[PDB]
């Protein structure tokens, strides 16, 4: 049985402007099977009240989900997305690279 590891993109809904509300997105795609753990991290810590899109899949049968929460970026706070999946030996963390 074939498994597929997730691709991960971390980005904001709008262009980042310190002080202004925005949305932080973690988009995981290309994975199979569908069980996946996705957490959003503020400076290192899990964020509560993160939502996510309903489970769908692409033409090649691999799944995708979008995890998001509202937030307000500062120059100080650093954000990241932490993904775990059966294909992954340890959780994988992708930092939000603003520019």
């Amino acid at each position: 049985m074939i498994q597929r590891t997730p691709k991960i993109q971390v980005y904001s809904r709008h262009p980042a402007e310190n002080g202004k509300s925005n949305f932080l997105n973690c988009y995981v795609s290309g994975f199979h099977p569908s069980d996946i753990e996705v957490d959003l991290l503020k400076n290192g810590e899990r964020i509560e009240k993160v939502e996510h899109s309903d489970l769908s899949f692409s033409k090649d049968w691999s799944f995708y989900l979008l995890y998001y929460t509202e937030f307000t970026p500062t120059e100080k706070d650093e954000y990241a997305c932490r993904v775990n999946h059966v294909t992954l030996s340890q959780p994988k963390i992708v930092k939000w690279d603003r520019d």
Binding site: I2, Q3, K7, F23, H32, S62, L66
Partner: protein, 276 residues
């Protein structure tokens, strides 16, 4: 111009953790509009876009009833497929199904689809003629013989040429202010030095709908397909999408590079250069 409706079914066994879960989602083009989840407190077809909310009680009752029946049938089908492959009760397995229709700008049916996968691999698909099946292996041949005797293909053909097209027409009219509004990308070019002699040029497209877009770099009018990093198109969360194409250029050769953007919401196709 043209449009599509697709339903996506996923049925997932989880031995030792209850009965298999059944999830259904419906899309018009790149817009989700309904969902059903058999783990929900009160399982029912539920709205995920404004323009579907106006549908009457008989709609939501029919869609919920079909989905409730599907929950049980897909549980039966996971047990059957586990047998077709001599698999043990310990593992979790997944049936996925996609079906729906494509219509051209006149609303006439271009083609219909129905196809299924088991644990991510093609299993059975309805042929384009909406009359015959392609089975992927001798397990799927059993499903094919079951479906021939059940006249599955004839029911799906009637659906795909009837309800699918009719309701898609109706959905496109009720959601015409979003489903038939093409939002152009916002574009710009960025410059990230890598070293003394090279830098990264990145062409950005934001806020566009639908997701279909063409982003390409050119060097002296010549396409840089091999040398362009394309990120997968991603959702912004507000219905719109984002994408970028990036190319690494010798420092000082920047103006030999052009980014080209085609999208349905653009008056004219775009040509962009790095503006220092």
């Amino acid at each position: 111009g043209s449009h599509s409706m697709r339903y996506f079914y996923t049925a997932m066994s989880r031995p030792g953790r209850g009965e298999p879960r059944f999830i259904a989602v419906g899309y018009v083009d790149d817009t989700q509009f309904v969902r059903f989840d058999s783990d929900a407190a009160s399982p029912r077809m539920a709205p995920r876009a404004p323009w579907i909310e106006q549908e009457g009680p008989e709609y939501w009752d029919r869609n919920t009833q079909i989905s409730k029946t599907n929950t049980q049938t897909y549980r039966e089908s996971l047990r059957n497929l586990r047998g077709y492959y001599n698999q043990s009760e310990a593992g979790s397995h997944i049936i996925q199904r996609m079906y729906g229709c494509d219509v051209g700008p006149d609303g006439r049916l271009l083609r219909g689809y129905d196809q299924s996968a088991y644990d991510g691999k093609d299993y059975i698909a309805l042929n384009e003629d909406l009359s015959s099946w392609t089975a992927a292996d001798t397990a799927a041949q059993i499903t094919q013989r079951k479906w021939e005797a059940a006249r599955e293909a004839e029911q799906l053909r009637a659906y795909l040429e009837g309800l699918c097209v009719e309701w898609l027409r109706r959905y496109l009219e009720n959601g015409k202010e979003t489903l038939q509004r093409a939002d152009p990308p916002k574009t710009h070019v960025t410059h990230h030095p890598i070293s003394d002699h090279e830098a990264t040029l990145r062409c950005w497209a934001l806020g566009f709908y639908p997701a279909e877009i063409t982003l390409t770099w050119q060097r002296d009018g010549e396409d840089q397909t091999q040398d362009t990093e394309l990120v997968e198109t991603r959702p912004a969360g507000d219905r719109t999408f984002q994408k970028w194409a990036a190319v690494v250029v010798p420092s000082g050769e920047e103006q030999r590079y052009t980014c080209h953007v085609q999208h349905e919401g653009l008056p004219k196709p775009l040509t962009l250069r790095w503006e220092p």
